[PDB]
Design a protein around this ligand. Structure first.
Ligand SMILES: CCCCCCCCCCCCCCCCCC(=O)OC[C@H](COP(=O)([O-])OCC[N+](C)(C)C)OC(=O)CCCCCCCCCCCCCCCCC
Ligand SMILES: CCCCCCCCCCCCCCCCCC(=O)OC[C@H](COP(=O)([O-])OCC[N+](C)(C)C)OC(=O)CCCCCCCCCCCCCCCCC
Ligand SMILES: CCCCCCCCCCCCCCCCCC(=O)OC[C@H](COP(=O)(O)OCCN)OC(=O)CCCCCCCCCCCCCCCCC
Ligand SMILES: NC(=O)C1=CN([C@@H]2O[C@H](COP(=O)(O)OP(=O)(O)OC[C@H]3O[C@@H](n4cnc5c(N)ncnc54)[C@H](OP(=O)(O)O)[C@@H]3O)[C@@H](O)[C@H]2O)C=CC1
Ligand code: SF4
Ligand code: SF4
Ligand code: SF4
Ligand SMILES: [Zn+2]
Lengths: 341, 176, 114, 48, 95, 207, 146, 155
């Protein structure tokens, strides 16, 4: 170890963890938790960002002076990528959109960009590489999102064979597009579900569990060249999960079946939005994709993390969706949803 | 000696009682107060046109720090650490060793400008006029780290501001 | 060994004050979880209350017990009147602090602290 | 300064510079001292 | 003088420069490293030695009360010059 | 006639000495020591049991009339078995004089609240309790006044570290301000300043 | 003046031999595992230790106990002492029994095979102090050092 | 051309935001006095469009003018969070910048950037009213550099 990266202190804000991490896509939902955890223990974090600097302001309080470094980068320019990684010991890739745009599509963000980061990182001598894939990645999937995840995951593996690839289920948390997505359907009255959501099983995972898994993968030498599946502790039918969301938010729940073709037609309607789409056809498919069971892969327990149950943290996410009448309701008012042994 | 601020007995003659009746009903003392703000409307305001015009300062002004040289270009600082000892905020950090020649000089000279109280004790303590507070007060930054000055930044400040600094010391050193 | 008492002449009077304070805290936890809108459960709050009482279970000095009860009551008055904020109530749970190892080997790897 | 020019020194900046904060030529702090402990370097040949 | 390390980083007048593989140089990427280009060790060595006709000379740095504390320098050795411990000016005895 | 030396006022010194023993004659049950400083300040050192009798006498007695409690504070001297010294600074407008009354206590011994004598003492005693941990009995409302809610310890004790044990920051994961063990990017630098040569022979202590 | 040797040539990381017989940095866990693996496969005379000159008592006893638990008794020092007779059984056999301050009460000192000036400089200063203030008589068997 | 239009629209919204900055009526200690002097007739911050308003709902800038204690830290975070966006923070003076002369105190937050993000750091103890006015103008030029709609366009 070079002398500047020998750990020192007691793992606090002013300590030296010895980690020099470049986190791509740090300005997102997962990125803010990864940067927070890295900063807590005194890591040097490089945050290359495409967005406008106002949108990185929430990251600045997460590290001691000089520990959070911001760079500009473009996914299509390799000089920008190489400048951001050439001094790092671990590169973390959290890049992704849930929708396509006129400038970037699922192939671009889930294949070309991850491959370029892995390619440039390897040439720069970066030793650790963590890449976030998806539990349901599949070339036979209806959703181009999941098809692109399968291709990119493969690509990263050849380009950077020692990469740790992490495949989470849907991640729930304060800024998620999962529990919040279901709660915001109330603005349309009833909740449409394909086949009433009785033919779908989800295994959502908690954001902090995923973050701790990523942090523990950096330090663990066993995590190199491995693929992990980060899943929550319980499996639910989609109908029960959405019903549970509305029970915690104390909103009237009026589910009704909607066929795939009709509901695929609603997704394209919302895709017209030149801004962030409320929903897309791809999202409709992903929501209704049953979460795979991959026993051969290691999970959170193999990284020393106890998966946090949904029931213990839903109120943390869903309290703000309640009206004034129900804001103060406590965590014990709603019965847990039915699980699947 | 003392005086009473509010110990009056008002007159009860008819004229004085009517003068107070007119005041109550006609709001005479309220109109008098309007006249005073009217008189300010027609005064020239005290605003200056910053940043084109500047507020007056004096040679003693305590602003941004700088490390000075002798006319030959040698550093004045001899790493005596008196400024570091007196600093009320412990804002100065110094390391020193013999230079490649035999000279006693600093290898570290930091001022944490976010610890500093701009009190000027360091320039009072300095025996060779090496550390001074200059006249610059327009150095706000976008990041905290930019206010943790190392020796290179402070030497640059002295090279940047010496022309003004030397003239200010010239005006005030006979009061010191 | 003759000293001026605070409130309790002996340890049996002191333990009566300790039991009374425990009841007040036990009754309060349901309200504190409601008013402050905590994401912990009432059992968690009451478990924490129990934990704080058991760290001092070895005291044998009534004056020391009297002071802990005195401090515990001020602590409770801050909570009931909502002088505390959510951050102060949650400081008892150390959520953002990582677990420090207690075994020798784990301490040995991280650093020099005993 | 037209009437009372300043005293000329070789080391005084000829070109004044405004506030550079927020630009590529801003000031970045760093430690100005050299490494304090030298680590032993193992021999480059095998012998064991 | 301001050398440049094989990486290209400028070496300061204290001899400081991040070595290869030191992550800390990332702090200068897209920015710059502040280095004063007027090395005092070089500038003082450009001052000519002053010839004086006495065994002892005094130096206050010049400028009276604007200089440094007044010190007296011995010039008895002829194998070297007398240097001021405050300002580094050199003196030699004229025969 | 000595421009730099502070002049003495022996009249005021004489007057304060006479009053000091006058108080000792009237309150012998409590007064333990009376002294007058070279700059003419009178201090009465009492047993803590006499806080109310002594302060009440000084306030109400016709030759005292110390109607104003200027200041009430504590000093921590760890080398004493009663480490805390409680200091009352009183002012008599009628006689244009000041008097200092001092007592002592430890960490476990309560001191009687003097709010019945001086209502000004209410907040001064909360501050002493807050910063030193001295308990005042029969206080109408004793609680912290200066330290953060839930703060642990008594910072003005000499063995409390300057920077404390905890510091605060905002944590994004829990979306609130959190408290964590204190770490300093730059440790406070302790200075050893005392000269090893005695400065004031007049105060030398026997070997 | 030798403290500046504490700033140079320092061992700062665990090191093991790589696959080419060269020492390379590794973690404590790996370094201790290799030693522990080798320790668990040997016993008796197969395990020995040598304590150098700057070792502390705590390290000495800890290493002695460790080798004892594999039944090894070969705890050696670099500095020789004759083990004949009582050897180290009696402390008086290998100590400066008069004590350093005892030199000031001596009247005759016999030095045998020792340059105390360099072997124990502050002990030689005590001898000179007695030689100067007490008229002590010093004799030497050995090289006529200064 | 979309590029030309969004470029102009950034100028419009950036100009509006920097020309109508309303600081929260919020001050902590000494440095609040120099802030009052910046509102006073000589500098008259109002002539720049800078108007104090008490409500966080109606504020764009938090000027942290003075020492932040641990007891006050949650309250400062509360009123910052209650500001609608876009919102900016100006750290005024050594205390708010990095703890200043109470840096080693047990009751003092060592810099308000531990609690909120900070856009501009104004040095001084206290900064002169003119030094603060320089800091506000530096924030205006920062807002003038924002590229929100250009970045949205290229997403
Ligand atoms: C709806 C119609 C409102 C249009 C008003 C446009 C504002 C014009 C303007 O920018 O003022 C001159 C300003 C003045 O520039 P300034 O604001 O940078 O001046 C700085 C302050 N002084 C001059 C005192 C040092 O011009 C601009 O800043 C360019 C922005 C143009 C706005 C975009 C138009 C499209
Ligand atoms: C008295 C009547 C007066 C009424 C005045 C009415 C306003 C007149 C001036 C209108 C100028 C144009 C308005 C554009 C303002 C858009 C708000 C904005 O900046 O959002 C940025 C956003 C930024 O989008 P983004 O996708 O790049 O990033 C935002 C998403 N997060 C938060 C995750 C980073 O851009 C848009 O919303 C679309 C801009 C389209 C412009 C139309
Ligand atoms: C021949 C038969 C004819 C019959 C009719 C003859 C009657 C003529 C005389 C009648 C009296 C005329 C005045 C009546 C107006 C009301 C007067 C009044 O009530 O003012 C007194 C009021 C009380 O204030 P105070 O003094 O504190 O209390 C008194 C004792 N309790 O104090 C106040 O009201 C003060 C109000 C404070 C706020 C004032 C702020 C504005 C001041 C500037 C206003 C200037 C007026 C401009 C009007 C514009 C016209 C369009
Ligand atoms: N439910 C979930 O959240 C799950 C997430 N994942 C994966 O985890 C990763 C992060 O999840 P999440 O944090 O929710 O993703 P977010 O959409 O929340 O954040 C995406 C990040 O990627 C950056 N980014 C997106 N597109 C581009 C681009 N074209 N060029 C440059 N930067 C870009 C964004 O930066 P900007 O803000 O500048 O656009 C942002 O920082 C993604 O790969 C996602 O697929 C996997 C399984 C489930
Ligand atoms: S001005 Fe005062 S606080 Fe600032 S560095 Fe000088 S002595 Fe220290
Ligand atoms: S700046 Fe002045 S006081 Fe400070 S170390 Fe240098 S010579 Fe001494
Ligand atoms: S920075 Fe200086 S003037 Fe401002 S609050 Fe702190 S001590 Fe007072
Ligand atoms: Zn000189």
């Amino acid at each position: 170890l070079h002398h500047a990266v020998i750990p020192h202190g007691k793992g606090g804000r002013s300590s030296v963890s010895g980690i020099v991490a470049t986190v791509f896509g740090a300005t997102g939902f997962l990125g803010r938790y990864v940067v927070n955890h890295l900063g807590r223990m005194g890591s040097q974090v490089i945050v290359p960002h495409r967005c406008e600097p106002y949108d990185t302001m929430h990251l600045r309080p997460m590290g001691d002076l000089g520990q959070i470094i911001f760079m500009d980068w473009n996914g299509r320019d390799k000089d920008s990528i190489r400048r951001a990684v050439e001094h790092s010991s671990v590169v973390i890739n959290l890049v992704g959109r849930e929708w396509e745009t006129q400038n970037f599509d699922f192939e671009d963000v889930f294949v070309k960009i991850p491959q370029a980061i892995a390619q440039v990182s390897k040439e720069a001598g970066v030793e650790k590489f963590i890449h976030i894939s998806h539990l349901n990645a599949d070339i036979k999937s209806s959703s181009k999102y999941l098809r692109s995840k399968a291709v990119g995951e493969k690509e990263v593996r050849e380009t950077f064979p020692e990469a740790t690839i992490i495949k989470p289920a849907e991640i729930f948390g304060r800024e998620d597009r999962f529990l919040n997505y279901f709660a915001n359907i109330r603005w349309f009255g009833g909740v449409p579900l394909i086949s009433l959501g009785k033919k779908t099983v989800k295994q959502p995972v908690y954001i902090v569990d995923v973050t701790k898994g990523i942090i523990n993968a950096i330090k663990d030498p066993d995590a190199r060249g491995k693929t992990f599946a980060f899943v929550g502790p319980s499996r639910y039918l989609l109908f029960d999960l959405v019903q549970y969301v509305f029970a915690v938010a104390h909103r009237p729940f009026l589910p009704y079946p909607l066929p795939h073709f009709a509901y695929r037609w609603i997704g394209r309607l919302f895709e017209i939005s030149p801004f962030e789409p409320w929903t897309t056809r791809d999202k409709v498919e992903r929501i209704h994709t049953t979460d795979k069971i991959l026993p051969h892969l290691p999970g959170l327990e193999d990284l020393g993390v106890e998966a946090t149950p949904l029931e213990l943290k839903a109120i943390e996410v869903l309290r703000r969706h309640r009206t004034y009448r129900w804001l103060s309701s406590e965590i014990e008012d709603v019965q847990p949803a039915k699980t699947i042994p | 000696t003392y005086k009473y601020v509010n110990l009056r007995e008002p007159s009860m003659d008819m004229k004085s009682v009517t003068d107070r009746a007119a005041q109550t009903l006609l709001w005479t003392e309220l109109i008098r107060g309007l006249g005073m703000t009217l008189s300010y409307l027609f005064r020239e305001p005290a605003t200056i046109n910053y940043p084109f015009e500047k507020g007056p300062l004096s040679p003693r002004f305590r602003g941004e720090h700088a490390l000075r040289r002798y006319p030959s270009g040698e550093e004045r600082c001899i790493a005596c650490k008196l400024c570091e000892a007196v600093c009320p905020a412990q804002a100065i950090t110094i390391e020193a060793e013999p230079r490649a020649d035999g000279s006693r000089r600093t290898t570290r000279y930091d001022i944490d400008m976010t610890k500093c109280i701009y009190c000027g004790f360091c320039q009072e303590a300095c025996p060779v006029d090496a550390i001074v507070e200059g006249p610059n007060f327009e150095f706000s930054t976008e990041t905290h780290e930019e206010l943790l000055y190392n020796k290179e930044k402070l030497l640059n400040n002295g090279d940047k501001w010496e022309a003004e600094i030397a003239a200010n010391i010239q005006a005030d050193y006979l009061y010191r | 060994t003759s000293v001026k008492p605070i409130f309790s002449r002996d340890m049996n009077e002191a333990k009566r004050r300790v039991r009374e304070l425990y009841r007040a805290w036990y009754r309060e936890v349901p309200n504190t979880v409601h008013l402050f809108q905590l994401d912990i459960s009432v059992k968690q709050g009451r478990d924490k209350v129990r934990e704080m009482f058991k760290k001092n279970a070895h005291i044998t000095d009534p004056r020391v017990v009297d002071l802990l009860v005195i401090k515990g009551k001020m602590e409770l008055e801050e909570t009931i009147k909502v002088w505390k904020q959510r951050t102060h109530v949650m400081r008892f749970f150390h959520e953002t602090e990582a677990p420090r190892p207690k075994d020798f080997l784990s301490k040995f790897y991280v650093g020099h602290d005993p | 300064p037209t009437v009372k020019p300043p005293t000329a020194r070789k080391f005084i900046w000829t070109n004044h510079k405004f506030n550079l904060s927020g630009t590529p030529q801003q000031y970045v702090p760093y430690s100005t001292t050299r490494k304090k402990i030298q680590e032993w370097v193992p021999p480059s040949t095998p012998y064991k | 003088g301001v050398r440049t390390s094989p990486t290209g980083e400028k070496v300061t007048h204290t001899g400081q420069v991040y070595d290869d593989g030191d992550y800390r140089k990332v702090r200068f990427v897209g920015r710059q490293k502040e280095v004063n280009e007027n090395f005092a060790i070089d500038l003082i060595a450009e001052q000519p030695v002053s010839q004086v006709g006495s065994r002892v000379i005094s130096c206050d740095g010049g400028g009276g009360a604007l200089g440094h504390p007044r010190v007296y320098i011995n010039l008895d050795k002829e194998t070297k010059t007398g240097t001021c411990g405050y300002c580094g000016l050199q003196f030699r005895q004229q025969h | 006639t000595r421009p730099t030396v502070r002049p003495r006022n022996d009249v005021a010194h004489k007057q304060l000495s006479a009053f000091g023993e006058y108080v000792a004659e009237i309150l012998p049950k409590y007064v333990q020591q009376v002294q007058v400083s070279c700059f003419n300040e009178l201090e009465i050192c009492i047993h803590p049991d006499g806080v109310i009798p002594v302060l009440t006498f000084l306030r109400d007695h016709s030759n005292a009339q110390f109607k104003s409690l200027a200041d009430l504070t504590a000093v921590d001297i760890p080398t004493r078995q009663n480490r805390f010294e409680i200091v009352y600074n009183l002012l008599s407008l009628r006689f244009n004089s000041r008097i200092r009354v001092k007592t002592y206590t430890d960490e476990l011994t309560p001191i009687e609240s003097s709010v019945p004598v001086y209502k000004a003492a209410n907040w001064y005693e909360r501050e002493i309790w807050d910063m030193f941990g001295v308990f005042f009995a029969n206080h109408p409302d004793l609680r912290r006044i200066l330290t953060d809610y839930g703060f642990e310890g008594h910072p003005f004790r000499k063995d409390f570290p300057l920077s404390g044990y905890v510091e605060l920051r905002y944590d994004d994961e829990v979306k609130r301000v959190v408290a964590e063990p204190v770490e300093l990017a730059q440790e406070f630098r302790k200075f050893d300043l005392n000269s090893p040569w005695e400065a004031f022979p007049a105060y030398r202590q026997p070997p | 003046f030798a403290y500046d040797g504490l700033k140079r040539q320092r061992l700062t990381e665990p090191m093991v031999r790589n696959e080419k017989g060269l020492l390379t940095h590794t973690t404590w866990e790996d370094a201790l595992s290799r030693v522990a693996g080798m320790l668990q496969s040997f016993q008796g005379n197969d395990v020995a230790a040598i304590a150098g000159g700057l070792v502390d008592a705590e390290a000495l006893i800890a290493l002695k106990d460790l080798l004892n638990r594999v039944d090894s008794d070969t705890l050696c020092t670099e500095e020789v002492f004759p083990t004949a007779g009582a050897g180290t059984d009696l402390r008086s056999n290998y100590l400066l029994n008069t004590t350093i301050a005892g030199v000031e009460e001596a009247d005759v000192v016999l030095l045998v095979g020792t340059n105390p000036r360099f072997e124990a400089p502050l002990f030689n200063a005590r001898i000179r102090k007695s030689w100067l203030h007490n008229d002590l008589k010093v004799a030497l068997i050995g090289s006529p050092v200064d | 051309r979309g590029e030309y239009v969004v470029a102009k629209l950034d100028d419009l919204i950036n100009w509006a935001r920097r020309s109508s900055l309303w600081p929260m009526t919020f001050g902590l200690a000494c440095c609040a006095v120099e802030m009052m002097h910046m509102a006073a007739p000589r500098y008259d911050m109002d002539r720049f469009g800078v108007v104090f308003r008490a409500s966080p709902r109606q504020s764009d800038v938090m000027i942290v003018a003075g020492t932040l204690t641990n007891k006050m830290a949650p309250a400062l975070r509360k009123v910052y969070d209650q500001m609608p966006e876009p919102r900016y923070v100006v750290s005024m003076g050594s205390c708010a910048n990095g703890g200043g002369y109470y840096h080693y105190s047990y009751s003092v937050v060592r810099g308000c950037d531990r609690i909120v993000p900070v856009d501009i750091y104004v040095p001084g103890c206290p900064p002169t009213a003119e030094a603060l006015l320089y800091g506000i103008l530096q924030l205006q030029k920062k807002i003038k550099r924002e590229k929100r709609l250009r970045i949205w366009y290229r997403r």
